[PDB]
């Protein structure tokens, strides 16, 4: 509701990015994880320039689609983990009262310029009173995989954080048929000292 990362139409239940290694059985690390009091609110204008702007842009998207579908997530990614059979995946799960076809676009930008986009169409499955959308053990772009290597290979965490300053990920999920925007989640990262997050309603 106002407590969760959700709009009138689409509700994120799960998100997680991960590395799993094999060997008879399998073992894996969470780089991130959310799983579903009001949420606090961030001034959308305060992050505009950390995402692509003129034209097909965040500013544009916000003004247009419903202002109840825009969120900012702050992750503290856990990087403490160990090369052979490594799979780097990301899974997520959404819920909806209604049956749709969702386009999910996810943009990795740096310095506000997009450097890589990934787009997947997702269909619904009826379970209980509603419909579920599961993206499953996606794979994670080589870009990101390298990013993580270069990161982990840094003398001190705070240097990592410092580099992350200009790394963001915009994730826009729309309705295929009605190009209505169902969810827009902005992501900004730091490395934990130990994995955690704060979720914010974006406002203006």
């Amino acid at each position: 509701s106002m407590r969760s990362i959700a709009s009138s139409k689409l509700w994120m239940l799960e998100f997680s990015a991960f590395l799993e290694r094999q060997q008879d059985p399998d073992t894996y690390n969470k780089h991130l994880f959310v799983h579903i009091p009001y949420l606090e609110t961030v001034d959308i204008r305060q992050i505009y320039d950390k995402f692509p702007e003129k034209k097909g842009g965040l500013k544009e998207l916000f003004e247009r689609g419903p202002s109840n579908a825009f969120f900012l997530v702050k992750f503290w990614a856990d990087l403490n983990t160990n090369e052979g059979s490594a799979f780097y995946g990301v899974s997520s799960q959404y819920e909806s009262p209604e049956n749709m076809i969702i386009t999910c676009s996810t943009k990795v930008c740096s310095f506000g310029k997009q450097v890589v986009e990934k787009v997947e169409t997702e269909y619904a499955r009826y379970e209980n009173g509603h419909y579920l959308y599961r993206i499953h053990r996606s794979p994670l772009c080589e870009y990101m995989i390298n990013f993580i290597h270069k990161l982990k290979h840094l003398p001190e965490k705070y240097m990592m954080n410092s580099v992350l300053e200009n790394f963001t990920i915009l994730q826009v999920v729309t309705n295929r048929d009605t190009q209505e925007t169902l969810l827009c989640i902005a992501y900004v990262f730091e490395v934990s000292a130990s994995a955690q997050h704060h979720i914010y309603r974006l406002v203006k």
């Binding site: 606090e40 609110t41 961030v42 001034d43 305060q46 992050i47 702050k74 503290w76 740096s110 310095f111 310029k113 450097v115 870009y143 390298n146 990013f147 270069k150 240097m159 410092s162 580099v163 300053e165 200009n166 790394f167 900004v188 934990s192 955690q196 704060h198 914010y200």
Partner: protein, 39 residues
């Protein structure tokens, strides 16, 4: 497009290799929780 190199030089090189002058997050009006991981 190893636009990822420019991510590391901006901080690590640090202002020889050219990326735009950028304003870090602790300097914007965001809530306080924004830098206080929970436990």
């Amino acid at each position: 497009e190893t636009d990822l190199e420019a991510l590391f030089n901006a901080v690590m090189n640090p202002k020889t290799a050219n990326v735009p002058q950028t304003v870090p997050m602790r300097l914007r009006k965001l809530p306080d929780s924004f830098f206080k991981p929970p436990e």
